[PDB]
Structure formats: C-alpha cells, structure tokens
Design an enzyme around this catalytic site. Structure first.
Site, short mmCIF file in Angstrom:
data_model
loop_
_atom_site.label_atom_id
_atom_site.label_comp_id
_atom_site.label_asym_id
_atom_site.label_seq_id
_atom_site.Cartn_x
_atom_site.Cartn_y
_atom_site.Cartn_z
N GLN A 102 -4.57 -3.98 7.58
CA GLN A 102 -5.52 -5.36 7.46
C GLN A 102 -4.72 -6.46 7.79
O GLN A 102 -6.16 -7.14 8.40
CB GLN A 102 -5.05 -5.96 5.42
CG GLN A 102 -5.75 -4.73 4.39
CD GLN A 102 -7.54 -4.49 5.05
OE1 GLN A 102 -8.01 -4.95 5.00
NE2 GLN A 102 -7.28 -3.62 4.19
N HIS B 17 0.36 -1.29 0.54
CA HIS B 17 0.14 -0.12 0.20
C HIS B 17 1.11 1.22 0.25
O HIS B 17 1.91 1.59 0.42
CB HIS B 17 -1.15 -0.07 1.23
CG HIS B 17 -1.77 0.89 1.35
ND1 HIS B 17 -2.44 2.25 1.78
CD2 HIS B 17 -3.57 1.02 1.55
CE1 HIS B 17 -2.94 3.05 2.34
NE2 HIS B 17 -3.85 2.35 0.95
N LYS C 214 -11.02 -0.17 10.66
CA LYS C 214 -10.07 -1.33 9.70
C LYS C 214 -10.67 -2.06 10.84
O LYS C 214 -10.55 -3.22 10.45
CB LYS C 214 -8.82 -0.84 9.33
CG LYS C 214 -8.24 -0.37 8.17
CD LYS C 214 -8.83 0.31 6.99
CE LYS C 214 -7.77 -0.40 5.64
NZ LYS C 214 -6.48 0.71 6.36
N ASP D 207 3.24 -3.70 7.43
CA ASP D 207 2.37 -2.58 7.16
C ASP D 207 1.49 -4.06 7.82
O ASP D 207 0.65 -4.84 7.01
CB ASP D 207 2.25 -2.64 6.34
CG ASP D 207 0.68 -1.83 6.04
OD1 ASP D 207 0.01 -1.79 6.76
OD2 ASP D 207 0.58 -1.05 4.61
N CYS E 145 -5.13 2.65 -3.88
CA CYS E 145 -3.48 3.12 -3.41
C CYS E 145 -2.75 1.56 -3.00
O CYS E 145 -1.93 1.18 -2.63
CB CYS E 145 -3.73 3.20 -1.61
SG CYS E 145 -5.25 4.67 -1.43
C1 LIG Z 1 -5.91 1.16 4.87
C2 LIG Z 1 -4.48 0.36 4.87
C3 LIG Z 1 -3.84 0.98 4.75
C4 LIG Z 1 -3.58 2.67 5.42
O1 LIG Z 1 -3.97 3.33 6.48
P1 LIG Z 1 -4.62 5.14 7.45
O2 LIG Z 1 -5.69 4.67 8.51
O3 LIG Z 1 -5.03 5.14 5.67
O4 LIG Z 1 -3.29 5.62 7.59
C5 LIG Z 1 -2.08 0.87 4.58
N1 LIG Z 1 -2.08 -0.29 4.23
C6 LIG Z 1 -3.08 -0.64 3.90
C7 LIG Z 1 -2.36 -2.35 3.55
C8 LIG Z 1 -4.29 -0.87 3.87
O5 LIG Z 1 -5.20 -1.30 4.18
#
Ligand SMILES: *Cc1c(COP(=O)(O)O)cnc(C)c1O
Ligand SMILES: *Cc1c(COP(=O)(O)O)cnc(C)c1O
Lengths: 400, 399
Positions: free
Chosen positions: B198, B118, B221, B195, B357
């Site tokens: 998810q 992302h 999320k 990251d 994104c």
């Molecule tokens: C949604 C998401 C993000 C971004 O999170 P924010 O709350 O917009 O900072 C980053 N990486 C992944 C894989 C996402 O799904």
C-alpha cells in the site's frame, strides 16, 4: 472436416509483417489477436462489481478466467480442472514439485534420475533439493540417436530411486524420449515422474491420463500466450500430498499468531493475487488454438523444418542436431562464428538465435558450446525456408 | 509540477464503465500508457528483426531496460541492481524469509511481526519459524490502532533477528513510525522486512533515508500489470541471500556435480521473466513520474475525509480509518456487509467487504470483517456524493 490452412493461421498474428521471417518460436511464440484483444480488454475495464456500459465484455473476461483451468485440462486430457495449478511458468512449476513434494519425502541416499537433455529448469531444482536432503542426482545419458536412453533406464534404477525428471521434448534437438516406457519403468520402482513439457505442450500436448504422468509443466509464452504464466498439472492425490508453496493470502484458510491452515489444492499452492491478465490471456490462447488441428499444424511445421534441413545440409560444414524430424532445427556451420551468422541473418530479415539454450550438459554431450537454432511454427511458410537458405548462402560468402 | 485531478482522471479508459470505483486498495485501474505498452509488446516480435515497427520495438526495449532504474527512482534506491523482479509482494516476502532468514535462523530465534500485517507478511514467517525452530513474536497495536513501535524495546531480546512491519495497513491505512522501529531493530542487529504494497502507492518509501533492509510492493496496486512485483534489498543483503528458484538465467555454470549462480539481482530471478509485466510496470512508473504524488495523495485523502465526515453523520457508523488515510474501512451497526456491497453495486458504487487478508488485525479490532472504500487520485467529489447517497438508500432498505 477440419483441414489446417496455413494462410488463415498466419492471418491471426498481427506481429507477423514486422517480425519478418520469424524462426525463434521455441524461445517464445508470437500471439494471435485473440490474446492481444483479451489482454487489452482486461486492462481497459474495471475488475469491480460495477459496469455501466461494458457489462457484456466484463462478463466475457470473467468467463475466460473461470474457464481457464478447464481449458488447460482439455489440452492435457486431465481428469478435472482442480488438477491444474497456476505458476509463473515451467520453472516455478518444477521448483514447486521439488520443494513441496520431493523435499519432505527424500532421505539421505535416495536417488533422483535426471536426463542429460534436461533444460536447466528441470535440473537445477533437483541439484538443489538433492543438496538439501542428502539425495543424489543420477544422470540418464543419451543414446546414439541423441535421445535420453530409456533402454538403459532400468539399469540405472535402484531401490533408492524416488524421482525421474525427464523432458517430453528437448528445446535443442526437439527430441522426444519414449515417455510411456520411461514412466512404466519409473512406476515399476514406485517412483514419481516430473515431465518438463515446455516444448511438448506446444507440439505434442501430453495426454496426462493415457501416459499416467505424475507431474507436467509448461509455459504460456511458448504456447502463443502471455508471459509470466505457467501450469503445473499433478494427479489429485499428489497435489493433496504436497506441502504448501508460497505463504500468504488466498492459499490460507485461517490465520493466527499461533499458526495457520490452508485451502486444499490447487488454491493451497497459489498464494497472493494471481496473474489474472496471464490466466485470462492463456485461456484466450487455448480457446483460440482449439479451432485448429494441432496434429496437422505440427506436421506442417515439421515439413518446413525438413525442407530447411535438407537444403542446409547441401551447404559446407553443416551439422544438424535435429531429432525425429522435429519442428526445431538446431545446427552449426563449421568455421563460422554463431553471433556473426545470427547478425547477418537478422540483416536479411531472418529472426533466430544461437547460444546454450539453458542446456549446458546436453551441449557438452554433443561436443559444442552452443548451437544456432531455427524453430518453425504453423505461421511459417515455404518462402520462409527459401529466405533462410538464401540468407545462409549469402552469409557464408560474406563471412570468409 | 501542479497536479490536476481531471488531467490524471482522463488517462484511465475504464472509468466510464467503472462507475464510482472505490476499491483501488484491492487493485488499481490502469492508465492508457500501461494498456498501450502492453498492446505493443504482444503485437510485435520480441525477435531481432523488425521490418516495419523498428521505432516501437526500440521503445519497448527502452522501457524494459530502464525498468529497474524507474523502480529505483521511485524508492530512491542507491542503484538499480538492488531491484529484484517478483510475481508480487507475496513472493517478495517469501523470498526474504526463505533466502535470507531461513539459512540464518537458529532455534529459539525470534521474528517480530506486527498484528496489523497482511497475511503476505505473516504466513511466510510462521512457515520459516516452523522450519527452523524460531518463534514469531507479536507486536501489538497502540491506542491509535497502529503497531506499537514504542513497545519494541520491551519485545526485542538478544534472540531477536527479524522485524516484519507494514509501511501502511490495507485496512486502517495506518502508517507506523517506521524510522523509529528501524533504529531499534538495527540497534539489536536485526533486519526489517517492510511490506510496502500500500505504501508504495501512497507514500513510496525513501529506502536510503529510512535505511530499509527489504521493501516489497505489487505492480497491480500501483496502476500496473498483474503478475509483477518488486523486492528491494540492500546490495549486501541481496548478495548474502541464497538463490531463490533454480533454473535458467539465475545460473552461471551447470553440470551434474552442481552449479554456480549469477550475482544479484539475477541470482534471484530464475526462468523467463514476466516481460509484459516488467514493461507494463515501467510504463506505469514513467507515466506516474509526471505527477506530484503528494498533491495526488492529498486529493485522495481529502475525498476520504469528506466521505468519512458525511457517513459519520449517519446512525450506527463506525470507522477504522487512521491518519486521514485515503483508505476508509468502516461498518454500520445492524447491517450485513455483503448486503450493502451488493446494493451499492446496484447503485453504481464499487467497493468491498471481508477480512482483507488480515484476520489477526480484525480480531484485535473486535470485528469479523469491514466494508472498505478506498480513494485514488482519479476519484472525484461527485464520487463521494454518490457513495453517501447510495449508503442512504441502502440503509433504508436494510435498517
Ligand atoms: C495487496 C497487499 C498484499 C499482497 O500483494 P499481492 O500482489 O497479492 O502479493 C500484501 N500486503 C498488503 C498490505 C497489501 O495490501
Ligand atoms: C522454455 C523452457 C523451459 C522454461 O520455461 P520458463 O517459462 O522459462 O520457466 C523449461 N524447459 C524447456 C524444455 C523449455 O523449453
């Protein structure tokens, strides 16, 4: 015409009964029902494209969201809503200006004038960027009336001066320096001015066009709104000149493993998922606040603070740090531990605080390590003043 | 503790109005516990006096003070001082790149970033690379559309300093071999930015077992407030990090000659915290703790499979789904994505399309965008039936 009615203003705040005598609005404000309800709605409804029974409510939320920047602009008399940038609060706003505007422009030897009355938010970031660039932070001291000495400013400005960091209103003394004069002096020398309006936005919202302010920052939680939301106003050309802030989604246009391009301001400066709840709640706060004459509300708050100060000054060992009949009353009682007084007052249903208020240099100027602080807002009353004074009397008797 | 989809589902007040909601991967609906805790926080003084709501005030304070620990329990973090509050996954990653990496990167140093990342876990690395003369090295996909962890040894060099890898893609739902990537990285003395935006929702990482250096996710999320996120970091790394933003709270002493700071996590948390966000996230986590996530996730995944199997029987169907994920990114030959999204909405189905994104990932997949239906534990079999029927109706009017 609109005539401020304290009783009806009070009725808008659900927390009031439980809050007792709430005199710490300078730390954070109580919220009107409109903000509570707007927030409840937001978290109780899908943000998706389907609404099978609450479409009207969802549409209202969207309108609040899409109108949020404009409502901030209207508060500040900003020329257009694209000069409004969302942040976590005043602190991020200032750091952004320091890192995105100042840092790429400062050279070794350049000077950043910062007032000794600045809240840490408007000092630490400048010490940081100074360290990073070889710039020097130059102190703007207080005058005899405890205000940043704007008369002295021209003497402190040199050909090396690039930035002025000045608070519109102190969170301790409530003092407001001659901002218009300071900005004229700064601009005479080709400087840019960072105005900390975390307090000023609440009590004397700045007309950023009239005052020709370059950057202006405030926080939502202080302005009867949500936590975790703030504003950075900047002249359009300055926002354009700024480097991107955080990197990620939204702020970007195209991305590859070779590099990236960005949106233009304000979106350039807003990476990732916004604090939507915060934006919607702040919008609701501003829209709600618009039904009240802030001038009359503030005079009411100031008049209560004056009743309080006048009465407390009749008690022994009293010292006031209050400037310009501010709604904010910072004070001390000699021979009394602040924590004991705060506690005793809390037992009497009076909510205030003591401590350093994130303004160590200022307190050092005043010859103290901390102060008590009672701050008044338009939902306070004369009986609140009486209660405070009465509780202090009892406190002084009990703490011998 | 046995998971019951109906019990879980009944906790989300938005559902009646939401219709068939299949975009949880973008943002999650909230349970009553989050709504109520938020209502209470904004309906009560944060002051030291409570004339009539002392009990509720205490509960709020309890939620607030227990917040870091509840995040720690989710991640099996060694202690709650390893948890740092941010505005979201995005800020969390930027903080690592600026506060840990930037001061340590010399020119020529290499930052390995997967092509599945992302933007949040790519752009900050492009930035810090430009700032330091370091270089971003791509970690491409294997045949299963996953970051090729097996290829890492050919990519790691003596200059390799950082690995940026997503625990779970927000497009394919794919989860790369994180344990193996980490072992390789650590063999080369690197640190890993995971990251988990998810992953935290579906398979929250055991950061100790996986020996993760940094871990980021967002509250919104994870059935929680907006404007709140988490950065987990090993206590040594957090200590080694430079300060983030400057201001109150993060400082110890301040003068016009300089300043000193608190230790982590407060060192990295300037200004007034998003208290509502923290309390709300605490509430979400506490509520979530009652449910067996594995069973909840199994349900979501099973629904995604029923959906994919069905849609696969339609002409021109294409799926980018990995590992039977609860995320179902797909495409239909000969349809404008925006058109199908619009019609599905008209039919009561809420999903999305676009680049999500993840431009580099999509470029690699050979597409400009995709549709995405994401399933959560509050979805049902009838949601799948409804999605399928709405797609049938849509395809008629378009193809
Ligand atoms: C949604 C998401 C993000 C971004 O999170 P924010 O709350 O917009 O900072 C980053 N990486 C992944 C894989 C996402 O799904
Ligand atoms: C509250 C305040 C700040 C900081 O606001 P945050 O929301 O904590 O960033 C800065 N300056 C003054 C004068 C304040 O009162």
């Amino acid at each position: 015409m609109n005539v401020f009615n304290p009783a009806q203003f009070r009725a808008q705040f659900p927390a009031l009964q439980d809050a007792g005598v709430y005199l710490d609005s300078a730390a954070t404000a109580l919220k009107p029902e409109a903000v509570v309800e707007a927030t409840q709605q937001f978290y109780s409804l899908s943000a998706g494209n389907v609404h099978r029974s609450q479409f009207a409510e969802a549409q209202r939320l969207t309108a609040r969201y899409e109108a949020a920047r404009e409502k901030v602009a209207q508060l500040l008399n900003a020329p257009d809503d694209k000069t409004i940038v969302w942040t976590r609060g005043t602190t991020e706003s200032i750091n952004m200006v320091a890192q995105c505007y100042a840092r790429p422009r400062l050279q070794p030897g350049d000077e950043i004038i910062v007032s000794v009355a600045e809240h840490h938010a408007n000092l630490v970031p400048w010490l940081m960027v100074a360290q990073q660039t070889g710039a020097k932070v130059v102190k703007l001291p207080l005058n005899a009336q405890r205000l940043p000495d704007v008369d002295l400013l021209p003497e402190l400005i040199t050909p090396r001066s690039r930035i002025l960091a000045l608070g519109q209103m102190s969170n301790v003394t409530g003092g407001c320096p001659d901002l218009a004069r300071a900005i004229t002096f700064a601009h005479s020398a080709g400087m840019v001015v960072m105005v900390d309006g975390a307090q000023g936005a609440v009590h004397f919202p700045a007309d950023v066009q009239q005052l020709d302010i370059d950057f202006y920052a405030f926080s939502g939680h202080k302005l009867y709104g949500p936590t975790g939301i703030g504003v950075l106003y900047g002249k359009s050309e300055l926002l354009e000149a700024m480097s991107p802030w955080l990197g990620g989604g939204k702020m970007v246009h195209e991305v590859s493993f070779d590099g990236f391009t960005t949106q233009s301001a304000p979106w350039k400066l807003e990476a990732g998922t916004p604090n939507v709840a915060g934006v919607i709640g702040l919008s609701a706060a501003l829209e709600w606040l618009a039904d009240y004459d802030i001038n009359q509300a503030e005079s009411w708050s100031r008049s209560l603070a004056t009743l309080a100060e006048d009465a407390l000054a009749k008690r022994p060992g009293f010292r006031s740090f209050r400037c310009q009949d501010s709604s904010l009353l910072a004070f001390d009682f000699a021979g009394v531990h602040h924590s004991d007084m705060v506690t005793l007052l809390a037992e009497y249903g009076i909510a205030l605080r003591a401590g350093q208020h994130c303004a160590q240099p200022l307190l050092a100027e005043l010859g103290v390590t901390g102060t008590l602080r009672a701050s008044f807002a338009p939902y306070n009353t004369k009986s609140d003043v009486d209660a405070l004074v009465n509780a202090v009397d009892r406190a002084l008797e009990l703490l011998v």
